[PDB]
Amino acid sequence: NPLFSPYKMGKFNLSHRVVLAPMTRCRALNNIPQAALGEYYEQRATAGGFLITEGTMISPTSAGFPHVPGIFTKEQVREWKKIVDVVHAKGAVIFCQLWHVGRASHEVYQPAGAAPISSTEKPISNRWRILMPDGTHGIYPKPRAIGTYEISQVVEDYRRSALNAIEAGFDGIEIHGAHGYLIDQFLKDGINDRTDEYGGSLANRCKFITQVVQAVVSAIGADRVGVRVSPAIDHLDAMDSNPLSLGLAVVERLNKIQLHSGSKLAYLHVTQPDYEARLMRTLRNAYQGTFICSGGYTRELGIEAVAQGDADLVSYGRLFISNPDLVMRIKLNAPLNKYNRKTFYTQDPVVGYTDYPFL
Ligand SMILES: Cc1cc2nc3c(=O)[nH]c(=O)nc-3n(C[C@H](O)[C@H](O)[C@H](O)COP(=O)(O)O)c2cc1C
Numbered sequence: 001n002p003l004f005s006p007y008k009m010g011k012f013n014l015s016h017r018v019v020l021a022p023m024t025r026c027r028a029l030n031n032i033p034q035a036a037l038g039e040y041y042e043q044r045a046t047a048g049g050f051l052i053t054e055g056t057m058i059s060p061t062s063a064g065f066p067h068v069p070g071i072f073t074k075e076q077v078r079e080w081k082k083i084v085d086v087v088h089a090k091g092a093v094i095f096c097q098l099w100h101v102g103r104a105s106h107e108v109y110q111p112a113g114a115a116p117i118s119s120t121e122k123p124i125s126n127r128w129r130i131l132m133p134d135g136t137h138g139i140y141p142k143p144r145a146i147g148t149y150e151i152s153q154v155v156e157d158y159r160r161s162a163l164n165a166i167e168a169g170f171d172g173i174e175i176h177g178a179h180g181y182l183i184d185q186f187l188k189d190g191i192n193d194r195t196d197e198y199g200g201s202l203a204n205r206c207k208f209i210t211q212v213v214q215a216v217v218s219a220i221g222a223d224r225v226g227v228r229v230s231p232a233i234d235h236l237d238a239m240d241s242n243p244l245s246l247g248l249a250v251v252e253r254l255n256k257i258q259l260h261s262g263s264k265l266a267y268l269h270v271t272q273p274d275y276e277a278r279l280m281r282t283l284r285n286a287y288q289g290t291f292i293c294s295g296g297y298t299r300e301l302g303i304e305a306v307a308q309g310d311a312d313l314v315s316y317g318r319l320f321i322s323n324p325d326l327v328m329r330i331k332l333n334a335p336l337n338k339y340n341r342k343t344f345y346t347q348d349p350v351v352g353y354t355d356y357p358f359l
Contacts, residue, residue, distance in 0.1 A: 002306040003299075003330060006048075007313065009290050010223035010266055012093045012171060014313070015048025017306050018327045021271075021294055021317035022052040022097040022174070022228075026345040027353055028069035031057055032076060036349030037069070038083040043324035043354060045092035050313065052226075052269075055099030055176055058161035059154070061117060062182075063109045064101030066133045067347055071096060071164045072157065080168035088169065095226055095266070096165040097174040098158055098216075102182025103143035103191075104236050106130050117150065118143035119185045119192050119199070119208075124236050131345060151198065154182070155211050162216040162225075172224030172266050173216060177209050179230055179271075180238030187231070187246055190239035202249040210253045213265075222261050227254060228269035232279060244279050251286040264289045269315065271295045281310050299330050322356045334359045 004016040027036050045051055057063050057070035070076045080096070087094045101109075103118035110116060121143060129137035146154070162173045177183030185191045186208040192199045198207050209227075216225050231240060231247040240246050251268070258264050268287045272280060272295030284291040293311035302314035320326050322339035329336055343352020 001303060001331065003303050003314065005306075007290075009050065009093070009313070010264060012050070012266075013048070014050055014093065016046075016327060017313045018049065018302070018330055019292060019313045019315035020044050020049075020051040020320050021315040022054050022176070023317050023321065024054045024065055024068060024345070025321075025353060026065060026067045026347060027349060029067050029347065031063065031068060031070040033069045033079040033083055034349060035082070036353060038086045039354050041083060041094070042086050042090060044320060044326070045087045045090040045094075046327045047091035049092045049327055051087060051092055051094045052174055052315065053094060053096040053170075056096050056161070056165075058098045058100055059157040060111050061105075061114070062100040062157070064105035064116070064130060064181075065109070065345070066131065068099070071098070071161045071168070077164050077168045080165070080170070084169040093171045095172045095174050096168075096170045097176050097226075097228070098161050098165075099176040100154065100157075100182040102185045104130065104140065104181055106132070106138055107141060108133060108138075115141060115144045117146045117154070118182065119145065119194060121145050122191070122193070128236050145194070148196065148198065151208060152211075155208075155215050158212050159215040159219050162220050166220050166224070172226060173220065174226030174228055174266075174269065175209070175213055175216065176228055177212070178228045179233060180236030183209050183212065184230070184238050187229070187250065188238050188240040190237065190241070202246065205246075206249055206253050209250065210257070213254070214257055217257060217261055217265075222258065222263040222265050224266055226266040226269060228271065230271045230273075231283075233271065233273045235273075244282060247279065247283045248286050251283060255286075255288050258288060266290065267292050267313065269294060271315075284310060299333065302330070321352075323359075324354075324356055325358050329359055332359075
């Protein structure tokens with residue numbers, strides 16, 4: 001089984017290639033990491049295993065989901081360290097994903113009912129609905145196009161949040177630039193209609209993620225900085241005329257950052273939509289460093305990816321909700337448990353969160 005061969009993710013020696021994908025569960029009430037988050041990640045942590053924390057707020061204007069954890073306040077830092085300590089006690093590596101929803105927000109999630117910030121003024125079309133705090137579905141409002149000065153302030157919110165994660169004891173951070181959110185609103189030409197230095201050509205549309213990654217690299221070190229992208233996912237109107245060209249464009253900037261800094265990044269996380277599809281390998285071939293593949297991967301598919309050189313690590317999401325011991329279940333080929341979509345974003349600390357049985 002090549003999924004349980006040791007891999008060196010920079011200064012982090014992992015015992016296997018099974019990675020917990022970042023998964024918003026909406027259990028951090030009032031944007032505060034609750035104690036149930038510790039029990040949730042401890043059920044999933046293994047010795048030498050890599051865990052990726054769910055999307056975490058970098059600013060009071062970064063949320064588009066109910067009860068999502070933050071890392072911009074001291075109170076959230078002292079609540080994150082209590083969970084990082086329990087995960088570190090099991091000998092696991094944990095990364096905190098910095099998440100900014102951009103235009104995928106709502107007045108109920110913004111302070112004083114302000115409009116969500118984005119690269120453009122176009123809102124998400126009406127075929128997508130945002131989850132409301134009361135369980136219903138609302139309408140994505142019209143965002144507000146920010147200038148270059150506000151862009152640098154959001155970049156600083158990434159840098160300040162990256163340092164708070166290391167203060168909380170995290171082994172590193174992952175830049176969430178996928179799934180049609182703030183960073184993905186700049187990369188995809190279907191959303192970025194700007195005429196300044198942040199829109200138009202591939203070089204201009206890659207400037208925001210380059211400044212975001214370069215800021216967190218110079219603050220906490222490149223080897224503790226992860227990057228997640230999704231050039232082919234069209235979620236929340238995140239369409240690109242040439243997804244393969246944009247993926248290679250993002251990789252080129254990531255390689256240039258690794259060369260000018262004299263150090264390698266932690267990894268490059270690429271997730272794909274649920275379905276040839278040779279875009280995953282093509283992006284792996286262009287990137288110089290660790291590659292994590294994501295999107296509809298199973299036990300045989302993950303083993304096939306590592307054995308064929310398609311990826312170094314394989315991250316699993318949905319199966320990690322209903323299988324806390326998914327790492328061990330993959331080893332023994334044990335049957336996996338089914339997951340309940342209804343309890344994906346509920347607020348109960350046990351029901352559909354930690355009540356999933358072990359093997
Ligand atoms: C309930 C749920 C929450 C998710 N939250 C996040 C998130 O916070 N950040 C992120 O980058 N992806 C998030 N995702 C996307 C997962 O990474 C996605 O499931 C993964 O790319 C595909 O893995 P899978 O085939 O095992 O389901 C979420 C997905 C689900 C279903």
